[PDB]
Amino acid sequence: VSKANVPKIDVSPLFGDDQAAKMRVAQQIDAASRDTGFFYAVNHGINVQRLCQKTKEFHMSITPEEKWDLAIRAYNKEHQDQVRAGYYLSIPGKKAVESFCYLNPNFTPDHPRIQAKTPTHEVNVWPDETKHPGFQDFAEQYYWDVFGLSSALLKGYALALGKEENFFARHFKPDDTLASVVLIRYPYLDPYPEAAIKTAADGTKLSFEWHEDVSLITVLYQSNVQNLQVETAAGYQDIEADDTGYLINCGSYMAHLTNNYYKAPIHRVKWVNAERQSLPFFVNLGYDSVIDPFDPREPNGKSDREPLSYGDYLQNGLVSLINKNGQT
Ligand SMILES: CC(C)[C@@H](NC(=O)[C@H](CS)NC(=O)CCC[C@H](N)C(=O)O)C(=O)O
Ligand SMILES: CC(O)(O)C(F)(F)F
Ligand SMILES: [Fe+3]
């Protein structure tokens, strides 16, 4: 298997005021987005070792009782308001992965979209503070840390596309972003049940099949265990692990807005019998956010795509991904 070209890009100028240095970062984002569609953001300022420490403490502390009490409606019919946020249980013998998803901490009971019961907005559920001391506070702060990195990355993508640096970020706001964090646990199992292993057409053993992301961009931390592959013209290629950087790729909303100039790369998760963490942040805009599609390969920049509101995109995309690749 070929090693995929996944450059390491120092994104630290995107936090500062050196506009020429920011354009040199934007060029690197442009190049990576036009090639394999993946890069590692380095010098990103986030303490990922502590993220891993706190997530591990959670995954290793949580009990079967708590998992039912936090479970999304796919696992617990009592929790009809929990579509996105909460616990996604494993099924021993059948489904190995388990995870905990949370949304914008500003989606509180008094938030206008929660009052309205607008789809894709939910109030987060949390375990009991006494059983998981500090976890909720850590997780909410992590949301804002990775929100900050993502805002910076979005300035880079905007400049890369010939736009002003606020072009995406003006739609990515603390009060209404639909962005989510998922704390995924992939277990070591001995024996590992075959029913929890999928097989690709090319014979590769998988934990999660080929897909494009439902996101504007995806901002991912993972353990130092190689598992991801990206489809290129030369076939599926291995993405090297780097548990110091964030792996960045575009989702299909970016592909829509740019008329596939920045494609949403097809990728999949190899089966690995290893205890590891996968911690994506899906960079989603607000429910009513709508960016007019354009084409940076066309002189007048015009596109034959129709505008699509982010809330429409997200609600439909998350259902479709479950139907295609299964309930996580
Ligand atoms: C590839 C990783 C990001 C990870 N896969 C994933 O997280 C997969 C594919 S991107 N993502 C999903 O299923 C969408 C979860 C959306 C989330 N519940 C939300 O409501 O916002 C894995 O390690 O399996
Ligand atoms: C969580 C971690 O394994 O990355 C370390 F090194 F911080 F302990
Ligand atoms: Fe993905």
Side-chain angles (χ1 to χ4, degrees), residues 4-55 57-72 74-116 118-163 165-172 174-197 199-204 206-239 241-262 264-301 303-305 307-315 317-328:
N5 208 294
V6 183
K8 310 212 194 274
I9 300 177
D10 176 350
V11 296
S12 64
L14 298 176
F15 293 103
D17 284 334
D18 185 344
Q19 311 303 332
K22 293 187 196 167
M23 291 285 291
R24 290 185 287 273
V25 178
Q27 185 279 322
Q28 300 173 73
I29 290 167
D30 181 75
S33 301
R34 293 164 62 188
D35 186 20
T36 73
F38 283 88
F39 67 95
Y40 272 105
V42 301
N43 306 114
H44 48 71
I46 296 182
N47 188 346
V48 289
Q49 290 196 307
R50 188 166 182 252
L51 171 65
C52 158
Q53 294 180 311
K54 299 290 183 181
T55 299
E57 290 166 6
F58 170 72
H59 281 143
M60 299 290 101
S61 299
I62 185 136
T63 66
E65 183 190 44
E66 298 169 88
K67 298 179 191 177
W68 290 122
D69 289 351
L70 297 171
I72 59 172
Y75 297 96
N76 184 338
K77 301 192 171 258
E78 300 182 13
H79 294 169
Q80 287 297 305
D81 290 334
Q82 295 185 237
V83 179
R84 297 176 73 190
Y87 211 88
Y88 296 48
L89 283 72
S90 67
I91 308 181
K94 303 285 174 252
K95 173 185 180 272
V97 69
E98 58 191 290
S99 62
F100 174 78
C101 174
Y102 62 100
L103 308 181
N104 191 336
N106 289 329
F107 291 168
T108 51
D110 59 2
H111 188 284
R113 291 292 192 173
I114 296 294
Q115 285 286 317
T118 302
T120 74
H121 307 74
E122 306 172 12
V123 183
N124 291 332
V125 297
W126 300 99
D128 290 342
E129 173 68 27
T130 52
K131 302 304 188 183
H132 294 264
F135 170 70
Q136 178 177 351
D137 294 329
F138 174 78
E140 292 179 340
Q141 181 63 57
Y142 176 65
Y143 191 101
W144 298 122
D145 287 355
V146 72
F147 181 99
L149 169 60
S150 296
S151 292
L153 293 172
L154 288 177
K155 290 176 196 176
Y157 276 99
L159 293 175
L161 288 159
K163 304 298 179 191
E165 77 174 13
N166 78 331
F167 181 85
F168 296 115
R170 71 188 181 303
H171 301 278
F172 184 60
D175 280 354
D176 57 30
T177 173
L178 290 163
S180 59
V181 173
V182 190
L183 307 181
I184 307 165
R185 178 193 170 193
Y186 278 100
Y188 173 81
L189 298 168
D190 177 26
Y192 207 108
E194 291 276 20
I197 303 169
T199 309
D202 75 5
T204 303
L206 305 178
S207 292
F208 196 75
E209 258 285 20
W210 73 266
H211 65 285
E212 299 186 332
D213 282 357
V214 182
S215 70
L216 178 61
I217 66 174
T218 301
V219 180
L220 174 66
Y221 163 93
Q222 301 200 308
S223 304
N224 193 188
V225 182
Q226 201 280 319
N227 65 103
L228 292 173
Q229 301 184 309
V230 54
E231 191 173 47
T232 73
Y236 279 90
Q237 294 183 339
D238 283 331
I239 296 168
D242 189 336
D243 69 349
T244 75
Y246 276 87
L247 185 67
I248 317 304
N249 63 274
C250 290
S252 58
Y253 197 78
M254 185 71 80
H256 180 66
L257 292 177
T258 70
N259 196 36
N260 235 20
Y261 176 64
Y262 293 174
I266 296 292
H267 56 286
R268 67 189 185 189
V269 176
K270 290 193 295 185
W271 168 71
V272 186
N273 193 2
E275 190 69 49
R276 64 192 183 82
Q277 305 169 330
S278 180
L279 318 178
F281 183 65
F282 297 107
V283 177
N284 295 322
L285 304 183
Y287 193 80
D288 283 340
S289 304
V290 54
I291 292 165
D292 294 332
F294 59 100
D295 192 341
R297 294 181 283 194
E298 282 325 320
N300 61 19
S303 187
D304 289 331
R305 285 170 182 259
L308 172 63
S309 74
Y310 205 89
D312 287 352
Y313 164 80
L314 183 65
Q315 203 194 350
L318 291 181
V319 166
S320 296
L321 184 58
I322 291 160
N323 293 347
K324 186 188 120 47
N325 281 10
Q327 175 63 63
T328 58

